[PDB]
Write a protein that binds this DNA or RNA. Structure first.
Length: 105
RNA sequence: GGUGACCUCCCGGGAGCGGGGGACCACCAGGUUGCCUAAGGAGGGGUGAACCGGCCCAGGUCGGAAACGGAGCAGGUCAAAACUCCCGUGCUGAUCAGUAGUU
């Protein structure tokens, strides 16, 4: 239950910083989905679980392609980093951003 | 000096979110002014909706165990998106009396 949250808004290049986004547009992507996010995180060997029915507070678009939240574990609950490659939320996001595009395209 | 946006960094957080460094843009107030006008007030208003302003936001809604918060509707509201009318100012058609002043 002590896992960092991650909304797809954080990575969406068609959203302003005030609309949620957490990473520079240059590194961001178009319309990332919680599904896409979970898949690229898990596939690197991260412990991730997907909450299909959480919405972003700042998200306004009531249709399914923008719903969803991805929870990720960084820590084994002895305080140590599950992985050394992923110390921070930002380190997660930037990676997901880097990996999502190799899927569909 | 102010407002609103937008971009890019840190920092704290399980969320909504919290702390802080830069960059840029728009507008505002009112303090000096000009290689400035034919004349250019630092006026007065109104719209600000079907989503585009900003603010306050019932409900609802998203996040939350909750506190509370986000986004924001109906309604209210504006020194400060944008739009627009009026006043002033400048040129510029025109009207009336057959009015004069003087023939």
């Amino acid at each position: 239950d002590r896992f960092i949250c991650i909304y797809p808004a954080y990575l969406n290049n068609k959203k302003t910083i005030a609309e949620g986004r957490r990473i520079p547009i240059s590194k961001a992507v178009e319309n990332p989905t919680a599904t896409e996010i979970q898949d690229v995180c898990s596939a690197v060997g991260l412990n991730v679980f997907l909450e299909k029915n959480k919405m972003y507070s700042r998200e306004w678009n009531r249709d399914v392609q923008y719903r969803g939240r991805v929870r990720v574990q960084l820590k084994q609950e002895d305080g140590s980093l599950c992985l050394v490659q992923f110390p921070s939320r930002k380190s997660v996001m930037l990676y997901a951003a880097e990996m999502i595009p190799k899927l569909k395209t």
